RNA sequence: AAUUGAAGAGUUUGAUCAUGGCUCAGAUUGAACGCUGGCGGCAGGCCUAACACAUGCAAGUCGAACGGUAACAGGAAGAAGCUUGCUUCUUUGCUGACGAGUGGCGGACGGGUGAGUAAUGUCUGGGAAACUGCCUGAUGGAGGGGGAUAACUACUGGAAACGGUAGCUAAUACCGCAUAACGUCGCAAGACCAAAGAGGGGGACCUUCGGGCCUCUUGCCAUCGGAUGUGCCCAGAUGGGAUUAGCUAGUAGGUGGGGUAACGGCUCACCUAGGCGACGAUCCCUAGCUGGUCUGAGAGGAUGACCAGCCACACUGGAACUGAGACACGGUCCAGACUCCUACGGGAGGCAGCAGUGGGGAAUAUUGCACAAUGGGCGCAAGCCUGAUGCAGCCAUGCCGCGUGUAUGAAGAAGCCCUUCGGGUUGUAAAGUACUUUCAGCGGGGAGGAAGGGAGUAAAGUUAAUACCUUUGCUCAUUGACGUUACCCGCAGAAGAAGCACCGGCUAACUCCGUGCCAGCAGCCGCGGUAAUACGGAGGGUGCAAGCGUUAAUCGGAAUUACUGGGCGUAA
């Protein structure tokens, strides 16, 4: 960079990228352990699990990482699916 | 931006006095009105249309001495305006305060009163107007400025105009040096020499 | 806003030499001791003192340098081997400098070199240069030895302690040298008398002459090139130098000391206008060099004799006649290149953004009108045929000529139009050798050079009457003609000479030009080896027509079918164009020189004693000339100069004809 | 009142009519070249190499976020450095500021360019499945903790680029927890999700002497709105070529899952065999689109510099990241081409921002001035930044205006030219005699673009306060690059200001003398071999004028692609 401000925004970049990804990850971990538990065919291990990911996708939503668009969605795909496999 | 070659020879060319010349003494005598101007200016030739249109545009062009550019976006002007193309290209040529000056009698000839423009001594409204191109409105004031009026040569073309024939159009009181254009001339009190219509041809060939 | 250094202060000073005098490493050694405590011309600041220094060329192939410095330079330095001294090339630039009138001093450098002798260098400057010269200082020792030098204005000595020009400890004149010092001395005051005569009164007088009684009586002499200051001392060794700068500035003049340039009115060239060293007066300078920096550009080196110019300005070129915006002004010094906003008079400087801008122009307001007067440079010694590799490289070729005949003045290129060949001139092998390289790699064009084709003729050497008929029934319209004439060897120079001899109108009148016209077109070709014939007289005594079949161009081609038979039996033979040679050389060389004369098919018309160097006449052919200058420095020990001008068309010899024949046959 | 609108001519023949092409008279230009050139206003100015670029500048700001305090002046203290306390030399964020750092916001705007693109473009008219920093309405919150970390410090490797290691520390930085429905999810019941504080002033009140509390100001969070911007869908329109006829396989549709802010083969699995095309698919060539510009009576034809909207692009080819917004001119990463620096151990770069250089070309300007005004970023504000923008420079490049004198002046001179050798023409033209001075030059005076922002001073609100602060009056001193401004007055003097093309016909203007099918001319027809109004030169004339010609280019004339508005027996 030649900028002395687009240099700062690289570095800040970087910390933000670093940061987003640590919650990324976790978020589609405990996502991915609700999807397993309905492909096991396990309701009270999917609900349970279900109710472990409300809370997360919730707070990543609000603090900005998805959107309660997606949050919203990641919920009713997995209720429908949870409900029916009970 | 001027003409400042011999106006005799211009009004030999045309065949016709265009008042070029104070006026004191014939142009007879000044110059050989009847024949054009050079070695063949005796022989007189047969002139196509184009040639008489030419003529005619030109005459016009010499008598309010105005260059072709400037005549030229008159004549769109007067074809823009609502009426007689033709009346109204003359209506223009006549509003130029230079015009007005000399039919008002300030000036002895167009070319003087020119100068008189040029030089600030003309006052329209009580405002110097220094543009030749400039036109009056019906219902203005033109006067002389204080040194104008002492100026000896406004005093002589007064003299002039009075031997002259009095526009119609134009109120103007000696002493005081003022006139007031009163409106814009009618193509009654232009002169009938002019055929306008040959201009209007020429311009839209 | 003000200059930092005073007109007084400026000092616009140019190094020349002979070859490997040490001129190079002078001028780092100079600039270093300046800058302690490249390009055109570097700006150093000694004592308070703007030193403008130029470091020219010893080659004669580069000559123009020395020239375009000399014209914008006010002092100079001479200098000059000890083992040697006066060399061919020493000569060359002194004369040069004597013309433009340039004050100079002399140093005599490798004093360390085995076989110096500080004498015999002063010895030369006297016999060789003739000029009024002596020594302001003296070595003590010489070679090895060498390691102190005597002030011999201020009788004092500077002991050099070593080869770095630092640690220096000034001493007394040894006791043994004071002598030797004293007697010097008193050869300087002599000749400095001769130039000043209240000095020569007060040496008359016997009064001891005050120190700097002398140094303004030398001071005067030198600036009126009247006597020339000697130094001496070791660049290498970083001895004397830091001497010589100070003979510099005590010696060398200033732009205020130097005679004012006058230059011609453009408006009026009778009107002469004389050029003061005024700031304030109107903006004068003339442009003495035009090179092209890779990262700025173009830039256009400057002397500013005249006024002030600021930056980001526009000034008019007088000899171009066209405006000319001077964006920005570099100053070059010792290492780096500083932008200067404004330049003074006496002030060399660059501009940046200049066009049509050549050397040797006047650069000034456009409210001035003055032209300086220009420098004058030399003409070609040798001309080679350049031609292009490649038909691609031609174009490139050519912008690639026009260009380089910019860039240096003494370098020339034309096209014949006979052979119709570009033909490159130079000032010498060296010259048009390095612009060829040039050309095959900056200008990226393969070029070849060779020996110029030379434009023969033909004449008849007998004379003939013959007759030529022309008769054409064959299809439909007939046409007719028949001319007697006869071809007499005309003498050399005269040209065509046709005589219309028809008696009673035996050849109407109407077809006689037509005959004359005919022969000249047949004449225009060759009649032997495709030269145009010339030197022959066409006698029209005699022919015949048909009134019917007489048509102009019938007699044309009888014309033409009579130069022919002509030929066969007039005897054409082959011309070659012979120069006028002029060589000027000291007579020590004149045997050499009238031996390769009559080697190269040549003849003496004769010899003079011009001057000091007997000039030869001679007429050789020009193919003979053919690499003259090099030779003839050869032989002159590169003291020789001529000049050749065509005279006259002579036969060729008959072996060499022959060949000729032979070659435009195929 | 917006309404003015339609011209022909030359050239095929011995002559004619027709047909038909060619040429010409007119407008217009980013123009170029030749010759010439006084001034001013206004505008325009790389159409070439999206060729390569030296150098400076074009994006910062905020201490009323935070730890600080390097740097300069203070504030006290102070060996007071000091000796007359004359001078004021140590201390400490204290304290106005403030380097670097952390943080916030901006950098996705503004500016450049038209390479690509014949349509995930543009234009016109609609649509539903979305999102939206700052700004604005309404309704509630902003509770209580923790773990870090830059700067910094020590040490240490670098030629440089810049780093490495161990401690250390703060926040409106970061993360749990509490609380939260007019939020999300769900049939419902339920379940679950947030924050940030920082400044101004001050009275009971108080220790923790910092504060706390009260109030004022600003900021933070949630939801629902507005406005604005943006994404997406559809129809029609928006070049040429068939000497391009077949094209397609995520292709066409369906079902389910995943994905997106959102719809959707967007993606994937599976199923069906579809989809498209002679109303031109596919392929090839060319090209940014539009409002508009030029021409035309119009219908059309041409065209898309400058201005404005839209799109695309940023060394080339990819790719994400951050963010409200980018797959980002002056950001990152990878690859490539190319260049540069070097201590040879390694580094660095992207003018299609403004100047400018080299190159290319017939050809297109200064490395200018100011942020005074408008507008934008940041900020509480002051202010700071702004090659945006306002101005200045260069250029007859265009449009427009003006000057270079006015009047008089006849044997009408001289001279030139012609001559019928008499005169005539040049020509009132000159000289001369009167006379006025724009503009130019010199000097003098002197608008408006300036609104605000300050210092306050008073009132009202403000609340505990009359605080603070805000608002409105009032007072006072100031705020212009242009700029030696526009403009006016005085000065003396006609001084300092005319050129270019053309004269055979077309087409306004004719002779003399050279030259003799030569040398030349030439839009077309044609001229030139003994005078040639056609060449060459001179006189005279004509047309234009600080311009005049020439070349290039578009339309017209050309009803000569005929929709308006043409033809096919013999002219196609
Ligand atoms: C600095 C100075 O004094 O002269 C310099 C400068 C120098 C004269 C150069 C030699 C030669 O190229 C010269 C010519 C004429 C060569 C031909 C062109 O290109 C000219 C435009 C050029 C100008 C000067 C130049 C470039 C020098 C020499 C001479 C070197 C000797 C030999 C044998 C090659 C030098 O430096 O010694
Ligand atoms: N012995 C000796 N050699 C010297 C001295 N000064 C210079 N030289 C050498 O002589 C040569 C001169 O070369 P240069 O300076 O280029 O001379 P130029 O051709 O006159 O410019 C170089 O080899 C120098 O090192 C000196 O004082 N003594
Ligand atoms: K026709
Ligand atoms: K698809
Ligand atoms: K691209
Ligand atoms: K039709
Ligand atoms: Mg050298
Ligand atoms: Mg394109
Ligand atoms: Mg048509
Ligand atoms: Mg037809
Ligand atoms: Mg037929």
């Known amino acids: 960079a030649n900028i002395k401000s687009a240099k700062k925004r690289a570095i800040q970049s970087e910390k933000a990228r670093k940061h987003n990804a640590s919650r990324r990850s976790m978020m589609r971990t405990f996502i991915k352990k609700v999807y397993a538990a309905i492909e096991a065919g396990d309701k009270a291990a999917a609900q349970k699990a279900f109710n472990e990911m409300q809370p997360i996708v919730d707070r990543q939503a609000a603090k900005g990482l998805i959107h309660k668009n997606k949050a919203a969605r990641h919920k009713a795909n997995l209720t429908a699916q949870i409900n029916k496999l009970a | 931006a001027r003409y400042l070659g011999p106006k005799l020879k211009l009004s030999r060319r045309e065949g016709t006095d265009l008042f070029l010349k104070s006026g004191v003494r014939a142009i007879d005598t000044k110059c050989k009105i009847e024949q054009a101007p050079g070695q063949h200016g005796a022989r007189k030739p047969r002139l196509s249309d184009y040639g008489v249109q030419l003529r005619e545009k030109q005459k016009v062009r010499r008598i309010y001495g105005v260059l072709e550019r400037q005549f030229r976006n008159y004549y769109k002007e007067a074809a823009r305006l609502k009426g007689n193309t033709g009346e109204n290209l003359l209506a223009l040529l006549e509003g130029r305060l230079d015009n007005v000056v000399y039919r008002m009698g300030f000036g002895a000839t167009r070319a003087e009163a020119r100068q008189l423009v040029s030089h600030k001594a003309i006052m329209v409204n009580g405002r110097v107007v220094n543009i030749a191109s400039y036109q009056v409105s019906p219902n203005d004031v033109v006067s002389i400025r204080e040194k104008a009026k002492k100026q000896s040569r406004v005093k002589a073309a007064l003299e002039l105009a009075e031997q002259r024939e009095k526009p119609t159009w134009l109120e103007v009181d000696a002493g005081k040096m003022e006139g007031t254009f009163k409106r814009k001339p009618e193509r009654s009190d232009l002169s009938a020499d002019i055929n306008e219509h040959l201009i209007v041809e020429l311009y839209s060939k | 806003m003000a200059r930092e250094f005073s007109l007084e202060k400026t000092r616009n000073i140019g190094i020349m030499a002979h070859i490997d005098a040490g001129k190079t490493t002078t001028t780092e050694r100079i600039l270093y001791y300046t800058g302690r405590i490249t390009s055109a011309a570097t700006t150093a600041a000694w004592e308070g003192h703007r030193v403008n220094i130029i ?65 015999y260098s002063v010895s030369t400057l006297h016999d060789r240069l003739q000029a009024n010269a002596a020594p302001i200082q003296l070595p003590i020792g010489a070679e090895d030895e060498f390691e102190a030098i005597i002030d011999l204005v201020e009788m004092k000595c500077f002991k050099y302690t070593n080869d770095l020009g630092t640690e220096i400890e000034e001493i007394e004149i040894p006791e043994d040298h004071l002598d030797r010092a004293e007697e010097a001395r008193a050869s300087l005051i002599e000749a400095v008398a001769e130039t000043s005569d209240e000095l020569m009164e007060k040496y008359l007088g016997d009064e001891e002459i005050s120190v700097s009684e002398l140094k303004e009586a030398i001071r005067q002499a030198t600036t009126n090139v009247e006597f020339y200051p000697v130094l001496c001392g070791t660049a290498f060794k970083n001895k004397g130098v830091q001497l010589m700068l100070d003979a510099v500035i005590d010696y060398l003049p200033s732009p205020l000391d130097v005679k004012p340039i006058i230059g011609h009115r453009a408006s009026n060239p009778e009107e002469e ?67 200067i906003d404004t330049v003074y008079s006496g002030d060399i400087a660059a501009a940046v953004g200049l066009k049509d801008t050549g050397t040797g122009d006047t650069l000034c307001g456009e409210k001035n009108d003055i032209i300086l007067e220009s420098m004058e440079f030399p003409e070609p010694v040798i001309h080679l045929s350049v031609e292009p590799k490649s038909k691609a490289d031609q174009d490139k070729m050519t912008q690639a000529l026009v260009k380089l005949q910019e860039e240096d003045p003494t370098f020339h290129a034309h096209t014949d139009e006979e052979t119709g060949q570009v033909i490159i001139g130079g000032m010498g092998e060296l010259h048009l050798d390095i612009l060829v390289d040039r050309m095959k790699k900056e200008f990226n064009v393969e070029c070849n050079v060779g020996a110029p084709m030379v434009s023969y003729r033909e004449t008849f050497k007998s004379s003939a009457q013959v007759q030529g008929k022309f008769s054409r029934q064959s299809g439909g319209r007939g046409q007719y003609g028949d001319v007697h004439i006869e071809f007499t060897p005309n003498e050399t120079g005269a040209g065509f000479e046709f005589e ?42 005699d022919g015949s027509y048909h009134d019917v079949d007489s048509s102009e161009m019938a007699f044309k081609i009888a014309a033409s079918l009579a130069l022919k038979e002509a030929a066969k039996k007039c005897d054409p033979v082959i011309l070659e164009p012979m120069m006028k040679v002029t060589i000027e050389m000291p007579e020590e060389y004149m045997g050499d020189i009238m031996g390769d004369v009559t080697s190269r098919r040549g003849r003496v018309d004769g010899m003079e004693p011009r001057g000091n160097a007997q000039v030869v006449n001679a007429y050789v052919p020009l193919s003979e000339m053919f690499g003259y200058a090099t030779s003839l420095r050869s032989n002159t020990q590169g003291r020789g100069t001529y000049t050749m001008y065509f005279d006259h068309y002579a036969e060729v010899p008959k072996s060499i004809a022959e060949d000729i024949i032979k070659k435009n046959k195929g």
């Open chain 3, 500 to 541: 219309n001899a028809i008696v009673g109108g035996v050849v109407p009148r109407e077809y006689i030009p037509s005959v004359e016209a005919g022969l000249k077109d047949a004449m225009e070709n060759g009649v032997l080896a495709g030269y145009p014939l010339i030197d022959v007289k066409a006698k029209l005594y």
């Open chain 3, 273 to 339: 206008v004389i050029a003061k060293a005024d700031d304030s007066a109107e903006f004068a300078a003339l442009a003495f060099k035009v090179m092209t920096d890779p990262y700025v550009g173009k830039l256009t080196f400057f002397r500013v004799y005249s006024g002030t110019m600021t930056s980001g300005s526009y000034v008019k070129n007088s000899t171009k006649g066209k405006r000319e915006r001077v964006g920005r002004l570099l100053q070059m010094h010792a290492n780096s290149r500083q932008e």
């Open chain 3, 55 to 119: 470091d020219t060329p010893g080659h004669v192939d580069f000559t123009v340098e020395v020239e375009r410095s000399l014209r914008v330079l006010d002092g100079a330095v001479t200098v000059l081997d000890a083992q040697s001294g006066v060399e061919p090339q020493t000569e060359t630039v002194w004369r040069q400098a004597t013309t433009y009138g340039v004050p100079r001093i002399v140093f005599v450098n490798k004093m360390d070199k085995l076989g110096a002798n500080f004498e």
